[PDB]
Amino acid sequence: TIRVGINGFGRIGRNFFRAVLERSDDLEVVAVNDLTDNKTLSTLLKFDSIMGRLGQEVEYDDDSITVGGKRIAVYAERDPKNLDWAAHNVDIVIESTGFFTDANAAKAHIEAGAKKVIISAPASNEDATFVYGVNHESYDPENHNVISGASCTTNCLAPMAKVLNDKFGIENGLMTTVHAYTGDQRLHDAPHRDLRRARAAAVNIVPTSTGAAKAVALVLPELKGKLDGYALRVPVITGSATDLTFNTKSEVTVESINAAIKEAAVGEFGETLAYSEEPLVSTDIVHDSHGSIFDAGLTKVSGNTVKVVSWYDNEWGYTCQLLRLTELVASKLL
Amino acid sequence: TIRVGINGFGRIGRNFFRAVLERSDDLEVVAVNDLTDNKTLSTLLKFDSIMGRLGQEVEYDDDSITVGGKRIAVYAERDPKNLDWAAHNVDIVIESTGFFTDANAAKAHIEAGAKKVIISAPASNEDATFVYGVNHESYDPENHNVISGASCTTNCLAPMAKVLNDKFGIENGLMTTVHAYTGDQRLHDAPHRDLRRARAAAVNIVPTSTGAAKAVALVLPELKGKLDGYALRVPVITGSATDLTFNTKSEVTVESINAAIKEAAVGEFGETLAYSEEPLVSTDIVHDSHGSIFDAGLTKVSGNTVKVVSWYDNEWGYTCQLLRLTELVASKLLE
Amino acid sequence: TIRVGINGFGRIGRNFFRAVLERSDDLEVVAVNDLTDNKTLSTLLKFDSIMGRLGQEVEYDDDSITVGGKRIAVYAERDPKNLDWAAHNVDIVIESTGFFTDANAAKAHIEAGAKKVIISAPASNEDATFVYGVNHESYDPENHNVISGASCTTNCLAPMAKVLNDKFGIENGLMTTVHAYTGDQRLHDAPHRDLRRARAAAVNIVPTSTGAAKAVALVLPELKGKLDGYALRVPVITGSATDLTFNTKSEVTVESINAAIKEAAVGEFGETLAYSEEPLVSTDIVHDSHGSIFDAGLTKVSGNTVKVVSWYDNEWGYTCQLLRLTELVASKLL
Amino acid sequence: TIRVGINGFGRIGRNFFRAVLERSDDLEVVAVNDLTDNKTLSTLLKFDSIMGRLGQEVEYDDDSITVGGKRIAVYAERDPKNLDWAAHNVDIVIESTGFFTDANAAKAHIEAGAKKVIISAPASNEDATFVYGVNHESYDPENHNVISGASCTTNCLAPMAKVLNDKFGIENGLMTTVHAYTGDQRLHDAPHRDLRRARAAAVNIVPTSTGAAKAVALVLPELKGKLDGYALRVPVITGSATDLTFNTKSEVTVESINAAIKEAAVGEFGETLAYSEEPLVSTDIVHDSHGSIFDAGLTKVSGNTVKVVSWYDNEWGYTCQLLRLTELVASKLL
Numbered sequence A, C, D: 001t002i003r004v005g006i007n008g009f010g011r012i013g014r015n016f017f018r019a020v021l022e023r024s025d026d027l028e029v030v031a032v033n034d035l036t037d038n039k040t041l042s043t044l045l046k047f048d049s050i051m052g053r054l055g056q057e058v059e060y061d062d063d064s065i066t067v068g069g070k071r072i073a074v075y076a077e078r079d080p081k082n083l084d085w086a087a088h089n090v091d092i093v094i095e096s097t098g099f100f101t102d103a104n105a106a107k108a109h110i111e112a113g114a115k116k117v118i119i120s121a122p123a124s125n126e127d128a129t130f131v132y133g134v135n136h137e138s139y140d141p142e143n144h145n146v147i148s149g150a151s152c153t154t155n156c157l158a159p160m161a162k163v164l165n166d167k168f169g170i171e172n173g174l175m176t177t178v179h180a181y182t183g184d185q186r187l188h189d190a191p192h193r194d195l196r197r198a199r200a201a202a203v204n205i206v207p208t209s210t211g212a213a214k215a216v217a218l219v220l221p222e223l224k225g226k227l228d229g230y231a232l233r234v235p236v237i238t239g240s241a242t243d244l245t246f247n248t249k250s251e252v253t254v255e256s257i258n259a260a261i262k263e264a265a266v267g268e269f270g271e272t273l274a275y276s277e278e279p280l281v282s283t284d285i286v287h288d289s290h291g292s293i294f295d296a297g298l299t300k301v302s303g304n305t306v307k308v309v310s311w312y313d314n315e316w317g318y319t320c321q322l323l324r325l326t327e328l329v330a331s332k333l334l
Numbered sequence B: 001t002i003r004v005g006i007n008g009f010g011r012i013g014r015n016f017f018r019a020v021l022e023r024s025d026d027l028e029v030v031a032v033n034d035l036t037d038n039k040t041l042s043t044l045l046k047f048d049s050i051m052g053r054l055g056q057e058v059e060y061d062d063d064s065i066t067v068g069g070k071r072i073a074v075y076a077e078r079d080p081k082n083l084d085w086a087a088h089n090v091d092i093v094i095e096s097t098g099f100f101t102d103a104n105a106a107k108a109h110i111e112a113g114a115k116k117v118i119i120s121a122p123a124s125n126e127d128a129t130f131v132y133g134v135n136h137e138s139y140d141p142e143n144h145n146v147i148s149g150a151s152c153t154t155n156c157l158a159p160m161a162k163v164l165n166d167k168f169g170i171e172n173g174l175m176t177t178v179h180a181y182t183g184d185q186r187l188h189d190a191p192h193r194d195l196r197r198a199r200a201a202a203v204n205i206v207p208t209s210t211g212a213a214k215a216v217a218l219v220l221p222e223l224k225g226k227l228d229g230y231a232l233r234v235p236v237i238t239g240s241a242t243d244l245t246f247n248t249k250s251e252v253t254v255e256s257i258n259a260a261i262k263e264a265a266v267g268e269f270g271e272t273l274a275y276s277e278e279p280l281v282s283t284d285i286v287h288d289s290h291g292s293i294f295d296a297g298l299t300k301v302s303g304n305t306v307k308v309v310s311w312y313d314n315e316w317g318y319t320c321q322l323l324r325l326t327e328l329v330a331s332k333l334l335e
């Protein structure tokens, strides 16, 4: 049993908590930190507008929350400097506040007693970035201590981009992700550093940035310089699609693009990348554990220009990818 | 011209700005304070997800925003004592941050040179509380300097309750407001002092508190102890309905209940309370200037139990009410 | 095994089918009728925007759908006169089209071979109307052959009203149900017999009629003349609340109102009526199997005036009530 | 005054009626046909969930609706051949039912007394297809009698594609439109010819086809064979964006792409195509009178791959395009 801490018990933090409880044979979460009281945090754990009710008993007191009879320590320290992970023999910390994506700030978890930190986001100054199934074999357990599990959109794009680039050669590609709103956006028009994410999220199509396409090149260096893109945030609470339009020198058809994905999406990698010929809408991919669900019915080809589309539950899909990365870390030294 | 300042250029602050510009012939907003830069503030002024584009040119610089050629000084002071309302000859400040609903915190504006503060919410320690059309004739220009315009829901409920209580006598009533989500609620499930307002606002029916419950007694003391209620926040961006179920000793019918409203909703008071027999849905009452839009189709009566329903645009409606109150304050002595 | 047919394989029809799979050991759905082809109907069975992916394997051909290896005959007959329920040895028909709530039309199912018809709505000219847990003991297997399971709202209100009426005496009450939109409302402003339900359902609070308050009298005749109310349809896809305000001569407090429900919400009746002190929102009661989930936190009292609020999943909760009624009819002579 | 009839008084029909009142001095709507009674149709005319209250007085009787004192005849004929447009001296019929896009069926309007039919959608067997501002100069008043004003998406894509093809050259391109839901989608999961459009529109991202990029080739024949694409329908009630990714014949920059649009978007053409550097979201382009609002901030370039995005109010903007086309027909023979 490896012991995990969660810093930032938010959408991703609580998705991760439930992913561990539900999916892992060898991890347990034993401490969490947020900015609220235990009555509030247990309530949010127990009841979820997306995931439904937790199917285990949840109690709390002024020190802790107890889930299915297992006591979890709870903190409310804004500054991780004030945490003590070692007091709970915690091995791995998930950094999911959204405020410590700089690895020089996140490393405070290691100063506070943990051996490893996994940032639930694109990072700065990290030791390494990983998309499980794409580049996790380059994980170095001696030297990779504060790592990123990249973004939701990256975990969707990279698996697809790898398969298609390996087979045919991507010359350049531009991406649009049509993406569930997230808590970074405002419910009502209000100040934001991004003037478009300032706008009422549940009644708007909101264009905004994604670092996903260039972040893809962090995990697939061969695609450096070859990808860029943006997001349209739209009114669904979770569930997203990545739409990539790329050129290739190869001779391709709808059928051979789709065959390349189907051929790859098997075995362990097929837990990351699924292939589908179903009449999917976003609600069909909510609570799907894949990082990427390729939608063969949406493939288009015009000359040497290809459009492909892959779905992802930006909460749960991404979380399951992060758990796969976490399991690997836990499988090796420290 | 009486000159007005706005503290907190949010939903209500910007609604208020547009209402003054669109509706008033004798007020001018000349200074605003918020917590952001002028690029951001002027974007949110020009573009609105509810009200649409402002039909006038909007420019900005390091110290101001200019609307239709009229320069508005802008500040970014978290503490209102770092403002100077007197420097721009501002007589009346709208307090619409949501953080200064305690009148003894809102009086920081007076310290900074204002003569009158109107809090855009239920207040504590306030000089007085008004729902325009209901009790504004009680306004005391000498003694009422930091005042409350009450809440959206109160401004909906009190007109209706007054007409009905006056005609038939309300023994007790209990209200449910089915209410648009507001910026106090969370887009995704996240911490909040209210465990239900914590929950994703646009996919949930969310039970919670309403101001109106007890606050009606501030403007209608004869109903102290006789009313209470709550809110169901639901997924519409604006537009709300107050549903009041009450007992009366009077013998009443749907018809006599409706006739009481229709006979009162006339003249000046008709600007606060309207009577409709239209097949209304919430989008029909968005951008309606009334505090309370009585829906005669929804009246029900069973023995001595009565149900009445009134609509309100909890943004614009309330805002037009606050503008009425501001106009009254501006029409009387400012010492 | 009692054999069931479903006329109208819509939201309620398909809920019902899933509920049978999940919750019954003696019923089997063997035939369904709708107005579409089997490719379309099987797709709607498999993929559901509310309930998610059906866990069984689904196939179809030109006259059936096969679910988990069990072949279900499919018809496409607008007029039930053209049905033959006897061909597949059907005992009970669920009438869930919306169009045959007059028992004089729904008895066509009997003439077509069925032994019992359960109308999934308030009916007219019916033999009996039941809310399970309220008046199901009055079911008469000889003489009750075309019956009504009432509405969703009636299954929410009646349990709560029975308990409060029995304990305190309801003089008169008026109800507002704040109700999810349903399929008979319009996505865009468009013709409807009801001028408000004509209006775009997902952007409006839409006032409309409900007979539930007068249908309660069919299952609790002691409340004849003493209840009325209406609905507000709001933009959630399922999940609803009944808000009842009533007068009583009893001396009552919030506490004693709440205690009355808690005391009753036990044993078998408790599978119909639940009692909750949780901080519930509508997503929390999606897929709850109760007809009625009383919210003790929302109880208010002013003198002799009382307001109570009970939740219901107008799809799943109602369906679980209809299945309980079906199970009773199935347990007796047919 | 040229007299207009509207067949199908739905979203587009009623937008058109309002556009005529607001924007025309030489057209008059004098009769309409739908499938409903006049109480219902007058209510829908008066109250609009998107456009708000009509500022004219509306009354009705059993064969008409009166607006601002002007009596409009109302028919309820499912079959166009049972209409008599000569009764009310109608010159031009807007065909906006969705059911008569085949010109061989739409021509029944001509037999019923009209001189010209404008189909508010891509057509089959038509005399000609027009995107105002792009190819309306090819209109032939002798020979073009049953015509199409194309789709919303075509009216958005074609102006932008004309300019970028003229200046830089499109080799091939693939489009995604992120599009408001429309009334042919289902509110609740229900039978539809399209198995995705079957799915609850207000909670899903719904992929579906669009002939729009291939219909561009009808108004810009130089682009025949060079465009394809699809739509994602998303939960906003109106307001859409067309995202085109194309390979350019010449090297370009973001700045030069943006400059080309700004340079062209002037004069009459600029009433069709606008240029924006504003931080736009969908609610900002609701009720905009342009067919295409080019968003300079979303232009991206990687090598010879280019992504451009243009907004459109798929109701009002398209309707303003349709009215421009109507004015042109009205200004000339018959």
Ligand SMILES: NC(=O)c1ccc[n+]([C@@H]2O[C@H](COP(=O)([O-])OP(=O)(O)OC[C@H]3O[C@@H](n4cnc5c(N)ncnc54)[C@H](O)[C@@H]3O)[C@@H](O)[C@H]2O)c1
Pocket: A007, A008, A009, A010, A011, A012, A013, A033, A034, A035, A077, A078, A079, A096, A097, A098, A099, A101, A120, A121, A150, A151, A152, A182, A183, A184, A314, A315, A318, B188, B190, B191
């Ligand atoms: N779809 C998604 O939501 C998604 C997917 C992939 C990655 N991510 C990333 O994961 C991170 C978390 O996003 P989220 O959607 O869960 O955000 P969130 O707002 O839902 O959760 C953040 C949580 O951290 C808490 N918090 C904030 N500052 C804190 C501090 N200093 N100390 C402790 N707790 C603090 C908040 O109270 C909240 O509970 C971000 O970096 C985001 O980009 C999000």
Ligand SMILES: NC(=O)c1ccc[n+]([C@@H]2O[C@H](COP(=O)([O-])OP(=O)(O)OC[C@H]3O[C@@H](n4cnc5c(N)ncnc54)[C@H](O)[C@@H]3O)[C@@H](O)[C@H]2O)c1
Pocket: A188, A190, A191, B007, B008, B009, B010, B011, B012, B013, B033, B034, B035, B036, B077, B078, B079, B096, B097, B098, B099, B101, B120, B121, B151, B152, B182, B183, B184, B314, B315, B318
């Ligand atoms: N929205 C409604 O329906 C509604 C209706 C009636 C009354 N009200 C009341 O009006 C008040 C404002 O509500 P809102 O909906 O406009 O909120 P909001 O969040 O939309 O706006 C608040 C604004 O104040 C600014 N702000 C916050 N703290 C500040 C400070 N210290 N100094 C300066 N600016 C500051 C914020 O940046 C924001 O722009 C609240 O008291 C609320 O109860 C709201």
Ligand SMILES: NC(=O)c1ccc[n+]([C@@H]2O[C@H](COP(=O)([O-])OP(=O)(O)OC[C@H]3O[C@@H](n4cnc5c(N)ncnc54)[C@H](O)[C@@H]3O)[C@@H](O)[C@H]2O)c1
Pocket: C007, C008, C009, C010, C011, C012, C013, C033, C034, C035, C077, C078, C079, C096, C097, C098, C099, C101, C120, C121, C150, C151, C152, C182, C183, C184, C314, C315, C318, D188, D190, D191
């Ligand atoms: N919340 C709810 O959805 C709810 C709850 C309780 C009761 N009900 C009642 O259940 C009934 C069905 O409602 P619903 O929500 O499932 O509606 P729905 O529109 O989802 O389903 C009706 C189904 O019947 C089919 N159909 C229509 N006419 C037909 C005919 N002549 N023959 C065969 N099939 C036909 C349709 O194609 C559709 O699949 C109604 O009476 C409604 O009042 C609905």
Ligand SMILES: NC(=O)c1ccc[n+]([C@@H]2O[C@H](COP(=O)([O-])OP(=O)(O)OC[C@H]3O[C@@H](n4cnc5c(N)ncnc54)[C@H](O)[C@@H]3O)[C@@H](O)[C@H]2O)c1
Pocket: C188, C190, C191, D007, D008, D009, D010, D011, D012, D013, D033, D034, D035, D077, D078, D079, D096, D097, D098, D099, D101, D120, D121, D150, D151, D152, D182, D183, D184, D314, D315, D318
């Ligand atoms: N965004 C848009 O809504 C949009 C944009 C561009 C083009 N269009 C096209 O315009 C047409 C109408 O689309 P809409 O969105 O207005 O649809 P709609 O569903 O809002 O309107 C169609 C109207 O036609 C009526 N109708 C149906 N069959 C009829 C018949 N046989 N005879 C007479 N009336 C009949 C309906 O009752 C309804 O009022 C379609 O061809 C559509 O593709 C729509």
Ligand SMILES: O=C[C@H](O)COP(=O)(O)O
Pocket: A121, A150, A151, A152, A153, A154, A177, A179, A182, A209, A210, A211, A212, A231, A314
């Ligand atoms: O949903 C949350 C993502 O991690 C942030 O989105 P993105 O991957 O498009 O940047």
Ligand SMILES: O=C[C@H](O)COP(=O)(O)O
Pocket: B121, B150, B151, B152, B153, B154, B177, B179, B182, B209, B210, B211, B212, B231, B314
């Ligand atoms: O909507 C904003 C109101 O002022 C807050 O609602 P309320 O009046 O029900 O408290």
Ligand SMILES: O=C[C@H](O)COP(=O)(O)O
Pocket: C121, C151, C152, C153, C154, C177, C179, C182, C209, C210, C211, C212, C231, C314
């Ligand atoms: O959910 C659909 C209902 O059966 C019809 O509404 P109601 O129960 O409120 O009458």
Ligand SMILES: O=C[C@H](O)COP(=O)(O)O
Pocket: D121, D151, D152, D153, D154, D177, D179, D182, D209, D210, D211, D212, D231, D314
């Ligand atoms: O909006 C209605 C259109 O006619 C349908 O969309 P489209 O132009 O992408 O086909």
